[PDB]
Amino acid sequence: MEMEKEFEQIDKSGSWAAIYQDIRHEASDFPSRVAKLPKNKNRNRYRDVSPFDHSRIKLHQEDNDYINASLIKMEEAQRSYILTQGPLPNTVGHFWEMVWEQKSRGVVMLNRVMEKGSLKCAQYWPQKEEKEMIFEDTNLKLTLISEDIKSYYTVRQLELENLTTQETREILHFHYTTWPDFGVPESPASFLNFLFKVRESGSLSPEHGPVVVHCSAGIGRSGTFCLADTCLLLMDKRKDPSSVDIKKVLLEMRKFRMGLIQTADQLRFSYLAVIEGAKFIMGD
Ligand SMILES: O=C(O)c1ccc(-c2ccccc2)s1
Ligand SMILES: O=C(O)c1ccc(-c2ccccc2)s1
Ligand SMILES: O=C(O)c1ccc(-c2ccccc2)s1
């Protein structure tokens, strides 16, 4: 079926939970043996969210190459994403090592450091220009260059220096700051505006390594971001845009990381975002 009318049909019939459970039942199951090794227990935030062995990002280190991060490679859309958990106190250096080694231009953050009165990820970037951060375990230096605070999101320019080689690179940090503590946003307009700002920066384009996107577990809000982006790109590429099937795209992405889209409300929000986005792209 098309998307916008499938949408009103699910709303009128109140069957979002049944649609979502079908997705969960059909999703891929692949091994995640490296994630479960005892030496990696303090490298995982949640025991039930792990990268598959076949798609996990490897650190260029011979001691321990493990990070909780996955490469999502969308062949028809010609887009790739790295989805990862929010960094932990003992993985902030690994996180920036990955950004460096994978040649990423941008980092997309969809959570606040504290939500619901608890810490959802480490404070992993510097908050003042004159107070830079040094990660001694991976030999990197990180400096805040500029910050632009808007009503729904903040963009930061960061300088990452590899202290071994003295090479430097400019990294863009895109921080969506207004996702509610509970539920999903009422309108997708600010989320879509944010996606378009990430696109306009070059961070999603083939001349760079894959964008790094995270929330707290790296599967819920993060899944919504890449699912909406890929669906909108396919609608622009195909002769028949009404052939794009958001449930089939989501099952393809779940071949590369488990659990993408955590609730039926997140699934409904993803449909809403793609539907509204397809009108702005042209023109209705
Ligand atoms: O950790 C493991 O060894 C596994 C996890 C999942 C496995 C599996 C088995 C049959 C079909 C599809 C997956 S095996
Ligand atoms: O040194 C540390 O930070 C840690 C040591 C052990 C940790 C752990 C975490 C989850 C489950 C079992 C152990 S974290
Ligand atoms: O009948 C339908 O579902 C559609 C008609 C046109 C669509 C479209 C979407 C994005 C970009 C260009 C066209 S989707």
UniProtKB/Swiss-Prot annotation:
Transmembrane segments: none annotated. It is a peripheral membrane protein. The modification Phosphoserine is found at S50, S242, S243. Tyrosine-protein phosphatase which acts as a regulator of endoplasmic reticulum unfolded protein response. Mediates dephosphorylation of EIF2AK3/PERK; inactivating the protein kinase activity of EIF2AK3/PERK. May play an important role in CKII- and p60c-src-induced signal transduction cascades. May regulate the EFNA5-EPHA3 signaling pathway which modulates cell reorganization and cell-cell repulsion. May also regulate the hepatocyte growth factor receptor signaling pathway through dephosphorylation of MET. It is an enzyme of class 3 (hydrolase). The modification Cysteine persulfide is found at C215. The modification Cysteine sulfenic acid (-SOH) is found at C215. It is found in: Endoplasmic reticulum membrane. GO terms for molecular function: cadherin binding; enzyme binding; ephrin receptor binding; insulin receptor binding; non-membrane spanning protein tyrosine phosphatase activity; protein kinase binding; protein phosphatase 2A binding; protein tyrosine phosphatase activity. Its EC number is 3.1.3.48. The gene is PTPN1. The modification Phosphotyrosine is found at Y20, Y66. The modification N-acetylmethionine is found at M1. Expressed in keratinocytes (at protein level). Oxidized on Cys-215; the Cys-SOH formed in response to redox signaling reacts with the alpha-amido of the following residue to form a sulfenamide cross-link, triggering a conformational change that inhibits substrate binding and activity. The active site can be restored by reduction. Residues 3-277 form the Tyrosine-protein phosphatase domain. It catalyses: O-phospho-L-tyrosyl-[protein] + H2O = L-tyrosyl-[protein] + phosphate. The active site is at C215 (phosphocysteine intermediate). Belongs to the protein-tyrosine phosphatase family. Non-receptor class 1 subfamily. This is Tyrosine-protein phosphatase non-receptor type 1. GO terms for cellular component: cytoplasm; cytoplasmic side of endoplasmic reticulum membrane; cytosol; early endosome; endoplasmic reticulum; endosome lumen; glutamatergic synapse; mitochondrial crista. Keywords: Acetylation, Endoplasmic reticulum, Hydrolase, Membrane, Oxidation, Phosphoprotein, Protein phosphatase, S-nitrosylation. The chain holds residues 1 to 284 of 435 of the full protein. There is a cross-link at C215-S216 (N,N-(cysteine-1,S-diyl)serine (Cys-Ser)). Substrate binds at D181, C215, S216, A217, G218, I219, G220, R221, Q262.
